[PDB]
Amino acid sequence: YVIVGVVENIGEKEIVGSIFYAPYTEGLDLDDPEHVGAFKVVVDPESLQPSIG
Amino acid sequence: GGKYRVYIDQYAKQDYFTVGYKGPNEMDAGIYYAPYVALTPLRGSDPKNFQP
Amino acid sequence: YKVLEDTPFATIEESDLELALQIAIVLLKVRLFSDAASTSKFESSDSEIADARF
């Protein structure tokens, strides 16, 4: 198929477009916040192999 | 009266008072609370879901 | 996929199921279900996290 649509940014708050994504990172302690999201590591208590997500 | 140390049982079930003795020596007190380990923290997380 | 309208494909004469599905998307009978999860999905502890593999 083919879709046409808009992405515009006038400034400060005037941001318009079809779907805004708009990720939420506040409160998350990040090394280079541009990354978005974070990694967590546990390591199994039986098998001792690492685990990450 | 300058004699008894008065404490309030904030959670008293009815209405009462208990008079007790406590000597200057640690062995003279009827009942002995003798802590060994206190408020040792534990930490971890569950590998199936990463929740702490 | 998720159904938007009761009896999706009720009006799709296409015999090739793959194309009938593409038509259902175009005609808004069915929507792609891909989406983020309600946050509670991964908080129950009775949880399943999709694997990443290589």
CA distance C51 to chain B (A): 11
Resolution in angstroms comes to: 3.4
Rounded Cα distance, B46 and C46, in Å: 11
For residue A8, what are its two tokens? 């515009």
Chains in contact with C, where contact requires at least 3 CB pairs less than 8 Å apart: B
- Residue type present at position A49: Q
Using a CB-CB cut-off of 8 Å, the residues of chain B touching A43 are 47
Of the partner residues A42, A44, A45, the one whose CB lies closest to the CB of residue B50:
A42
Contact C29, C8 (CB under 8 A): yes
Backbone angles phi, psi at A8, to 5 degrees: -140, 145
Q: What angle do CA A30, A35, A37 make, to 5 degrees?
A: 65
Q: Find, in chain A, the residue whose alpha carbon is nearest to that of B47.
A: A42
The token duo for C27 is 């005609």
DSSP for C4-54 reads: SSSSTTTT----SHHHHHHHHHHTTSEE----PPPGGGGTSSS--------
Cβ contacts of C49 on chain B, cutoff 8 Å = 48-50
> What is the residue type of C9?
F
**Within the 28-47 window of chain B, which residues sit less than 8 Å (CB to CB) from chain A?**
45-47
In the block, tokens 């593999």 appear at: C53
